[PDB]
Amino acid sequence: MLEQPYLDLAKKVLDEGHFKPDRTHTGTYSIFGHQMRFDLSKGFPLLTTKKVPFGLIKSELLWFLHGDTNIRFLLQHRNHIWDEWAFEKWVKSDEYHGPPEFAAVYHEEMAKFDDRVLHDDAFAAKYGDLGLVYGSQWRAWHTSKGDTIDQLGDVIEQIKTHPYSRRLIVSAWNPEDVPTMALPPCHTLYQFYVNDGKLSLQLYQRSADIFLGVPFNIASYALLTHLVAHECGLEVGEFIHTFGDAHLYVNHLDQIKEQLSRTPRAPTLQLNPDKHDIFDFDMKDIKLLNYDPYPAIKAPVAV
Amino acid sequence: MLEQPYLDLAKKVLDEGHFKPDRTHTGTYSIFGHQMRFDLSKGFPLLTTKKVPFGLIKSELLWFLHGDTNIRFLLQHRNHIWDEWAFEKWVKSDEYHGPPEFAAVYHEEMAKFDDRVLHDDAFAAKYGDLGLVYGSQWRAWHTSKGDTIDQLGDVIEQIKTHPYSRRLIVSAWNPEDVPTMALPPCHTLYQFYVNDGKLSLQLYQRSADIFLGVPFNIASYALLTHLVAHECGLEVGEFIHTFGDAHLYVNHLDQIKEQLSRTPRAPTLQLNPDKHDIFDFDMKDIKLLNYDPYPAIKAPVAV
Ligand SMILES: O=c1ccn([C@H]2C[C@H](O)[C@@H](COP(=O)(O)O)O2)c(=O)[nH]1
Ligand SMILES: O=c1ccn([C@H]2C[C@H](O)[C@@H](COP(=O)(O)O)O2)c(=O)[nH]1
Ligand SMILES: Cc1cccc2c1C(=O)N(c1ccnc(Cl)c1)C2=O
Ligand SMILES: Cc1cccc2c1C(=O)N(c1ccnc(Cl)c1)C2=O
């Protein structure tokens, strides 16, 4: 099945991984350097064996494609993926006043913050704006001359003109910023590849939470490859997912067994037949057919 | 054998690669996304089946470790690897006067240039200095504030303090410079990894000439892993070589058969037992034992 490689990497790490401490202080089982391929011509690799809300994948990806770094857009779409980190520029702040039942009055203050990012421009501008996150790296990289490079936009022209180039690289890794930056980007870099009609994409992912993060990350960049083939009028080849540290968090050990005895089912993807400027896609330009997942598995997001 | 993965990737590309045009206009057989592992504890992976001059690998690597970008240091060591690209800032120049038997009077003007880089400081400074090449990317990355980051140096402290970090990334890919730069770096990025006593390193290599380039590149970064384990007092785990476009150039098709019926032999590496500041290694701090290669195979360096 299309998603076997994901199931194989959970198996491998579980049966061969070596206990590893982590920044988080959860602890992990980990392997270094692993690859999976997904032949995108065979269907779209959204995990069946456990539910991965595609609404969520595409809003965030469209948030990336626009060069947006403000939670607000994600909020206009019920996407709460990135709420945490915007909340902390406010959870710490000097414009801040306010406070187990943390489990419930954390929600009360989260529902507050969401609300006024959603409606108060000045608050949004100060707390909603996540800053140095994939939208800026991708389409507004801060040149040393105080300018800004549209990196993805630039590489798509190059796919169109010089499809055969081995330089079709977009990076998210900025050595000037990674020392003191909230999340040095997990998706360090990717590279496209055109051979005879088919565009492929490889992601180098420095660090991978296999239970929680990877199901999504596969879809974000599988989705990204389609969208880029679409705009270049190419067919789709493969998505290659390459990993540094691929790890299972130790509290996810239960869940991943749970998931591993599921029996995989694979959806198809449908792109607007008459739009091509992907920087200009909204949610109805991307449609997933025949997604039939098993339900969500409850997992403690390890720190 | 230790070098089988290299032999397997030449086989794979030869038996499964798909004709691909290239910047060069030689043409190639290519695959996208491939990985090889070399367990450095089992011996050093310098190809036996064809000769790879280790003198050359280590001078260039020490040239990198010093943050040097001038051909001169390579010249003081009979390393001619990078002569070409320094010659062109002079092969084109406005301080330039001078001129088949290009095959022999190319050599006459190369032997001139080498000589006076070797001895004339001002010429060296103008023509020998390659500029934006792995030494600057690694230990002097040009911050946006006109400063300079010692990136490798910085990540080695982090290995020492935070060995378990999945952020141990050094990159050579600078989006501000890759549009108009002689060689966008083929060795785009690498990442270290420490699990229980053993340091590992993964290289993401965007583009790989499998006959000419890869034998060297394996050794440069296998060598790099040792040197870094050594300085951190770690043992050595694996070198993982990850590729974008791994290609055979079409004029190398003969040679790589020639090489493929050779029968692999694997050297050992010996590091100074009493030095650790690798930024301060000279050539006698690195010694290779029991290297026993088959001889060099003559190959047209495809553009
Ligand atoms: O898209 C993402 C973003 C984050 N992570 C995970 C990987 C790590 O477990 C954790 C924090 O990363 P480190 O900086 O500690 O590597 O978040 C993912 O798996 N996928
Ligand atoms: O260390 C190196 C440096 C260069 N190349 C090769 C790969 C390509 O065949 C050629 C030029 O690279 P491109 O920019 O066209 O990808 O040089 C290597 O294999 N290894
Ligand atoms: C809500 C939820 C629930 C389960 C798992 C995940 C998320 C989420 O936002 N992400 C995520 C995606 C992209 N970037 C980040 Cl920081 C996180 C997950 O991996
Ligand atoms: C002399 C010779 C002969 C055969 C093969 C190679 C070289 C060389 O300098 N390199 C090389 C290494 C690192 N960077 C570059 Cl641009 C080239 C080769 O791959």
Curated annotation (Swiss-Prot), chains A, B:
One Gene Ontology cellular component: cytosol
Molecular function as annotated in GO: thymidylate synthase activity
Enzyme class label: transferase
Alphabetical list of Pfam families matching this protein: Thymidylat_synt
Protein's UniProt keywords contain Transferase: yes
InterPro entries noted in UniProt: Thymidate_synth/dCMP_Mease, Thymidate_synth/dCMP_Mease_dom, Thymidate_synth/dCMP_Mease_sf, Thymidylate_synthase, Thymidylate_synthase_AS
GO biological process: dTMP biosynthetic process; dTTP biosynthetic process; methylation
Active-site residues per Swiss-Prot or TrEMBL entry: 186
Pathway: Pyrimidine metabolism; dTTP biosynthesis
Residues bound to (6R)-5,10-methylene-5,6,7,8-tetrahydrofolate: 209, 302
Recorded catalytic activity of this chain's protein: dUMP + (6R)-5,10-methylene-5,6,7,8-tetrahydrofolate = 7,8-dihydrofolate + dTMP
Keywords: Cytoplasm, Methyltransferase, Nucleotide biosynthesis, Transferase
Chief localisation class: cytoplasm
E.C. designation(s): 2.1.1.45
Compartments in which it is found: Cytoplasm
Residues the entry annotates as binding dUMP: 23, 166-167, 206-209, 217, 247-249
Entry-linked PANTHER family: THYMIDYLATE SYNTHASE, THYMIDYLATE SYNTHASE 1
UniProt function note: Catalyzes the reductive methylation of 2'-deoxyuridine-5'-monophosphate (dUMP) to 2'-deoxythymidine-5'-monophosphate (dTMP) while utilizing 5,10-methylenetetrahydrofolate (mTHF) as the methyl donor and reductant in the reaction, yielding dihydrofolate (DHF) as a by-product. This enzymatic reaction provides an intracellular de novo source of dTMP, an essential precursor for DNA biosynthesis.
Subunit and interaction comment: Homodimer.
Family: Belongs to the thymidylate synthase family. Bacterial-type ThyA subfamily.
Record-given protein name: Thymidylate synthase
Organism: Lacticaseibacillus casei (Lactobacillus casei)
Source organism phylogeny: Bacteria, Bacillati, Bacillota, Bacilli, Lactobacillales
